[PDB]
Amino acid sequence: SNAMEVTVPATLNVLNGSDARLPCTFNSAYTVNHKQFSLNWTYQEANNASEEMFLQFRMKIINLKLERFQDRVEFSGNPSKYDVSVMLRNVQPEDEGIYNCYIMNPPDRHRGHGKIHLQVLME
Structure with missing residues (x-):
């Protein structure tokens, strides 16, 4: 094909205080090689705001510990089965973005x- 298909929900609605799993799966003909696979997760308050990286995969998962998320970010995927989802625990209103x-x-x-x-x- 002409593109890597990536499947995410365009809009994800979560109750204040609950856990938000951000689903993200992709398609590729090739097996994921952990020594070369790359993954970047960023946050922005809006489309015209700067992107702030909070998680990366380079050889292994790198949690950047972005301050606005405390320690609530968890990797929730499995690159070997083409899943790179993240988990955001105990969501606050400021997590909107x-x-x-x-x-x-x-x-x-x-x-x-x-x-x-x-x-x-609102909860």
Whole structure:
């Protein structure tokens, strides 16, 4: 094909105080090689705000411990089965925003992008 298919919910609605799993799966002809696979997760308050990386895969999962998320971010995927989902525990109203997943799976030439708008409902 001409692109890496990435499957995410365009809008994700979560009750304040609950856990938010951000689902992100992708398609590729090639087995994921942990020594070359790349994964980037970023947050932005809005489309015109800067992206803040909070998780990366380089050889292993790297949790950047972004301050706005405390220690509530967990990797919730499995690259060997094409799942790069993240978990956000105990969501607060400030977690509302745009979450981007960027994927590269060498030697696959196409790179992937998923974009989720997380909205926090009143509890």
